[PDB]
Symmetry: D2
Subunit: 116 residues, 4 copies
Amino acid sequence: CPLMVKVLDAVRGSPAINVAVHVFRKAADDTWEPFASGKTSEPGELHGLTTEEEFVEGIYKVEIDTKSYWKALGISPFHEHAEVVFTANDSGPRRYTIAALLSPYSYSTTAVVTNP
Amino acid sequence: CPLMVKVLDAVRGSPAINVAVHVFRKAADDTWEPFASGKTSEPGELHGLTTEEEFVEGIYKVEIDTKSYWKALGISPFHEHAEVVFTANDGPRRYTIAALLSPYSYSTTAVVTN
Amino acid sequence: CPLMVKVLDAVRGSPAINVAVHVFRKAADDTWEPFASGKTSEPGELHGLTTEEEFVEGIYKVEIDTKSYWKALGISPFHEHAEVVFTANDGPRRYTIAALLSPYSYSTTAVVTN
Amino acid sequence: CPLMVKVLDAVRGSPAINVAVHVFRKAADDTWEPFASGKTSEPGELHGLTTEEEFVEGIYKVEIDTKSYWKALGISPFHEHAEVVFTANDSGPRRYTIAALLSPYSYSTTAVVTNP
Ligand SMILES: [Ca+2]
Ligand SMILES: [Ca+2]
Ligand SMILES: [Ca+2]
Ligand SMILES: [Ca+2]
C-alpha cells in the first residue's frame, strides 16, 4: 500500500470518518488527471487508493474534502478542502502516509515517507 | 488591508522571509485566475495584496511557494507548495492567512476579524 | 520587549482573547518559580511580561490556561493547559511564543529574532 | 492498551525512534508522582505504558523528551520537552492516543480518545 491517508478531528479528538479524498496526478500537458479516490473508514484511514504498479513517479495532489466533513457535522468551516501536493517516487518507490488534522478554521498536514 | 499572509519557519524558529505567495480567484469556468501576489518581508508578512474594492466574495486559493523557500536554505522539502483554499463571504471582515512550515509538514490557519 | 506570547483559536478563526498566561523560571531546587503573568489582549497578544534586565538565561515554562479559555466559550476541552518549556540563551534575541489552539490539539512555535 | 503515544519528525518525514516518554500522575498532595515511562519503537509508537487496572482517574502529564531526540541528531532545539497534561477517565475508562509532531522550534500534540 504505497499511499495511505489518515484524517483526525481536533475538535472532537477522534478519527474523521467518511471523509472523501481525491487524488490527482499532473499530466504531460500540465493538467490534473484523476488518479484515485476514496473515503476514510471508522479509524480515519483510507487504504487501497492505489497499487505499486499504478503509482508511478509524478506530481500528485491529494484533495481532502474537509468542507463536506464539517458541514455534515452542522459546522460552517473556512477551507474548501485540504490539498496536499508533492512529487512522488523520484528516487524510487516509497510508501507515503499523508496525515491531516482538521479544525474548522485550520488544518495541518504531515507526510511520513518510508522505504518499502 | 483585507487579506494578509503570515509565514513562520518551524525549523529555524523565525519568520519565513522572501517566500513567494500567489493568490488566485476561481473564475466561471472552474479555472484559477491570478488575483494577487508578492514575497514575504523580514517579519514574514505580506501586506497590500488586494483592496476592499477588488476582494469580492468568491473562492480563493493562496499558494505559498514552500519548495523554493526550503531550497534557498539548503533544507530538503516534501511539498511542492502549500495551497490554502477558502470562500470569502461578506459584516466587516479582514482575513489573515497564517502558515507554519516544516519540511514535511505545514499548518495553516485563517484569522478572520472585524 | 524580550518575551511575548501570541495565541490563536483554530475553531473560531480568531485571536484568543483573555487567555491567562503564567511564566515560571526554574529555580536551584528543580522547582518552578513564578516569573511573569498576564491575559492576552483583543489581538490575542500578551506584551510586557518581563524586561531585558529580568529575563536572564535559564529554563522557562509558559503555561497557557487553555481549559479556562474553552470553558468560557462553551466548548469542551481536552488539555488542562498548554505548557511550553525552553531554555533562554544569550547575541541580541527576542522571543515570541506562538500557540494555536484546538479543543483536542495545540501547537506552539518559538519565533526567535534579533 | 489505554494509553499510547506516537511521535513523528516533521523535518525528516519519519517516525521519531527512541524518544523517551515519561508519564506522571498528580498526587493527593498536588505533586507529580511517577506513573509510567518508555521509549518509542521503530514505528514511532510507545505501547504498554500501563494497564486498565493501573490507569485510574487522575490528572496525567506526558513528558516527551524532544530535546534529547534532537540532540542525538546533532540539532540544537528550542524546547526542553513536549509536556501534555490532561484529566483522564473522568466519565469512565477511555483509550487515549497522544500524538506529537516535532520540529526543532515547534511541536504540536493531539489527543485521540475512544470508548473501549
Ligand atoms: Ca526520477
Ligand atoms: Ca454570502
Ligand atoms: Ca549560554
Ligand atoms: Ca469521575
